[PDB]
Amino acid sequence: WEWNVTWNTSNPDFTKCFQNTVLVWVPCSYLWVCFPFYFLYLSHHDRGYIQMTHLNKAKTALGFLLWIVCWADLFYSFWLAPVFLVSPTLLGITMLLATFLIQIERRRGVQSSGIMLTFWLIALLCALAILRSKIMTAVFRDVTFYIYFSLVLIQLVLSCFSDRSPNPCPESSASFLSRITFWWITGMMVQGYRQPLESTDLWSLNKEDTSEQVVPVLVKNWKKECAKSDPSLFKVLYKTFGPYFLMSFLFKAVHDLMMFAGPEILKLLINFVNDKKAPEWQGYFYTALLFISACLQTLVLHQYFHICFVSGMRIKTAVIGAVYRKALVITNAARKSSTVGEIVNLMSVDAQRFMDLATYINMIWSAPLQVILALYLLWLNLGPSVLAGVAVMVLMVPLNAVMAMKTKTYQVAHMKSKDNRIKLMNEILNGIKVLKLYAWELAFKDKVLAIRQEELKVLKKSAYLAAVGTFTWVCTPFLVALSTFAVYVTVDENNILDAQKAFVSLALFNILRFPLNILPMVISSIVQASVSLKRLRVFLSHEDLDPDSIQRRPINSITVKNATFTWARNDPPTLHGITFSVPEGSLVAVVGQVGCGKSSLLSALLAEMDKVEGHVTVKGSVAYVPQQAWIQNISLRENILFGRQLQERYYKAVVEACALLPDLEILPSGDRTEIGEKGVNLSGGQKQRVSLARAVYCDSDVYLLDDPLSAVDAHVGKHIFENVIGPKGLLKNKTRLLVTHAISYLPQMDVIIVMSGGKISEMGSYQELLARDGAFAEFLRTYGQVKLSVYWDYMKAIGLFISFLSIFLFLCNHVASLVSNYWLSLWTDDPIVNGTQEHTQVRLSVYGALGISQGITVFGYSMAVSIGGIFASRRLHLDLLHNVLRSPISFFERTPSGNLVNRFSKELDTVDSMIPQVIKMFMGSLFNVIGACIIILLATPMAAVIIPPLGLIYFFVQRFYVASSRQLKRLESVSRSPVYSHFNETLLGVSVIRAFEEQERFIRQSDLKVDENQKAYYPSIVANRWLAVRLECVGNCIVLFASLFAVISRHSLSAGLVGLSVSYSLQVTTYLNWLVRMSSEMETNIVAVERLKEYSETEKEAPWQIQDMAPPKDWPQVGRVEFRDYGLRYDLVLKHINVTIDGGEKVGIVGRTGAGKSSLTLGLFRIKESAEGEIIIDDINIAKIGLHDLRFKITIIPQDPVLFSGSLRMNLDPFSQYSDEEVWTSLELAHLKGFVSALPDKLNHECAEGGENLSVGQRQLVCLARALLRKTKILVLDEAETDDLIQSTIRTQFDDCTVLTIAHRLNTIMDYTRVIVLDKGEIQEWGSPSDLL
Ligand SMILES: COc1ccc(CCN(C)CCC[C@@](C#N)(c2ccc(OC)c(OC)c2)C(C)C)cc1OC
């Protein structure tokens, strides 16, 4: 080895000894160090054995022949040089290890082989080097090498094909090349462009990713760790997911080391360029090396991502699964400790935090390592001056720190300021009819605007924080570079800033940019994950229930002796010393007062109570009808079935026996209707009916009916007891325990267990208990792509001047950056007078001025983008609110309130917060790519020949990502929420799930939900890997071509130009894929603006204020109403209505269900436009008057008064127009003075959502107080305990005003003269009640 023939000549030939020693030791050596390690994977991971195929044999036979050929050399050598003995034998032995390895890989089920691929690639390269040397030298031993090389090449080609297997995910059967390049998703991508992606096209999860495989291992590990007893969830997580984290650590270390090869090869290239008389091949070598290294880096890095992402995926699944399982075992006290919302948060935000932390968790050690290595390299280049740059990095430690903290604070406040608003919006939509009737649209618009501006103040304050953060991501490279260069050129004048010591350092600064700024974000995520992990450990350490506590003996039916139960370990017993024996097929009624311990008995028989002592021996399956009915959001049929085979005869015998036939009839789809909170709401009695029907269908032997007939009416209850619970019903032979407080069915009960204060008190049969005359007698005596129009709409909303100013400013940003780097290039070309440069001070001052301009410009650009973001959020929210409030009630009843809450919450969150960040990051990446291309073209114009093809590839890749990822990011969004919804419903009915022993069914359903979510999410991140590989293969191609065209034109190119072009090419690699990632996020985000602007063109109400034909101040002079041929369209509910209600004449409206009674009120307030009618009050037409005017001059007391959150005064007078004396007088006149004076807050009593704290009677009287305070001559009443009071009050002082009354009760209407009867919209009778009879 000497430089004359290897380095300093125009023919870069390796020496003969080097060829025969190191080039052969490299590949053989690779297999020798990997072989042992590879048994670990081959053994721990198995998939069966592959069959006997031609490919596998072809590879094995060539391995045998290759070994022979290599040993044939030893034979000829045996037939002087020491290397002619050891090298052939070593090659033969490693070759014998290669063929044995494909053999064992066949045995262990490895279709492709990465180890048997990289090894052949390394051998091929070594053979290629020797080959070129041997063909340049020119029979005896050469022909053996040609045979060796041809066999190695054919072996390498064979090793690429994937063997036979021993919508499945293609990753399982993908080859090594397809796995590293992520080609197995490519087809999906093109599919995602050709046709829309549904959940049916998503591949089945890998077996190792399915919930039923990951959750168990975590469950067993956690049980083992908690059995060893303080529990540590971190150790459990480590023990479960260690291999993935270690693999990610290895890949991140490799990437860390390989990303700094770029600057070293750039330094070598700059030395090559500035030094002429150097062999040209050295140049083309360096570029090639750089490209190769870069390629390797990206591959490694993306593998490092995949594992991490996969790991996070698995972790999320495990956590969710574990939580679900823990939800089914925890005692009642433990669930009372943490609210249902907090457990759902454990499922959602903690798991999401873990999965999104796993992406950058490894930077907690990579970033310090990257920083230390980069500082070492800079110290090699610059010297001690690098310390100054370190100072800037140190100066970036606190700022980022406080920045992070401040952001969190703002975010938290933002969250709060949003939640209230959403709650208020939830009150506006649920109660919009009342607001329209009372014309309170403007008041609640003002309230929502106030809360929104409170949120916008926090958003504006966080705009500055985000601008500071953007600055620390754009000027961190220059902030370090300017300091280091200034110190370097100032401390000693002999320090020359050549291209090697400037642009290599600049590339190092660009590298240092990421780790420095991501370390604070990683720390913040680690703290936010520490709190979530503490919550997860708190939940998973909660006490477990003992099914053993209750003896569940398969088929004296229920046995309890001396059993005392508790609701908590330290709380006193609720059931003291209970004993009773319920025989098989007997009806037992629990009897007591409120708080006696009746429901506690049924809870204790289900192992829900904490048994401090006793013995319970419930025999056979138990069907529980809880007091609070638990309804699944599935259809009513599946609610009754409860995951059981449908039997048409048994189902149709159960449904009517519960008297569910009328309920089925009223419901739209029958029994297929979607009952539950999300679907159609059901009355309490109907919910009890569904619960009882589910229990009866379940066909258990023991039934625990905790007050099944509380909410059903007396006739319905008696019918139910006759056909279901009674001795002649459906459950005649079933052991039925019924908790009741109704005597009507007591004599039919076989055994009555009457108790008092949680103690058995003389149980017995009804007649015997009555004869005894004791406790029971006492008890009885008790009583496509988004269009550019939406982008332009956001541009208009963001502020046209703001948008164009931001574009111009950030153009100045990138122009300043490019000019600063070109100025540095000119500075590096400066001649050196003696040991000093010509003009260093001037160039340094210009560099600093350009950089300070760039810093203030990025500050201003981020500031302006965020300011425009808050501007657009304000305008879009205001327009959405105005459109929603001005829209008719028909729109509200048509569109589900879920979509309106979606608009007001998630679209607003996307528009106001993350759209501006997406815009900033996308613009930055796009112009970084543009500037890199501009610099490459300026340095090497010929490189334009690479612009089309690569660009074409980019375009193609972009398309195949943008069309596909969105579809995968939509299917994720629709699949994540069901997982928590299911959990929430499970959390609500844990007792029902336990009682019916259907825990495994719900566990499997949760597994399926999480599996669907992961089937949506895994392609989402694999698509990111695929796009990143594709585009960092283009940016690597950009690096190679810029480097190659700089080497080709090295004579006309200065070293500074080469360094500048190569550094910008290095950074465009990272910037290019993020450009497309951001573009996809922008496309997904602008659909939010589209959704916000949807109701802007829908049909709106008539104008609230006309102001051309406004009525006088006293519009209802006497209150003379005249329906002149009124016809309401919603074929005609109201038709042929010609009636006249005189001023101050009491008139009521009577009719059956389906008549136009209520619709008539909607005619008065113009809720629905008159299809044909001329309602005129006094001498003024209603249709001509603006809505607000008439809605203010007419008052309505609806069926259910809607009390809004806030003070009572804001309920009575939202506008605060009426004085306090008027409010007090109206409240006194509403029989409410005594109560309203009782609240400590006086008139400012904070009533909750819907007035839950207030009683129904009080809310009704508050609505009456509203009507009385309005002091209008026309009043409408909608009648359904306090009836005597409200009727008297409406008959007390409103005799002066004209009152219409729609009452379902004839008793009240009889008092009112001039009754109007509506049969089917027609006026059946028009006259006084005296003429009625
Ligand atoms: C590409 O230019 C920019 C990059 C980042 C920023 C700051 C935006 N901040 C929210 C920080 C983003 C941080 C981050 C993300 N997401 C990021 C995005 C894009 C990046 O450049 C390709 C990046 O590397 C510098 C980091 C990390 C966490 C992956 C502004 C930029 O320009 C205005």
Ligand SMILES: N[C@@H](CCC(=O)N[C@@H](CS)C(=O)NCC(=O)O)C(=O)O
């Ligand atoms: N050179 C950086 C690259 C890290 C990187 O790619 N950053 C962002 C994108 S520029 C990322 O992690 N991407 C996550 C994703 O795939 O969504 C390093 O030090 O790892």
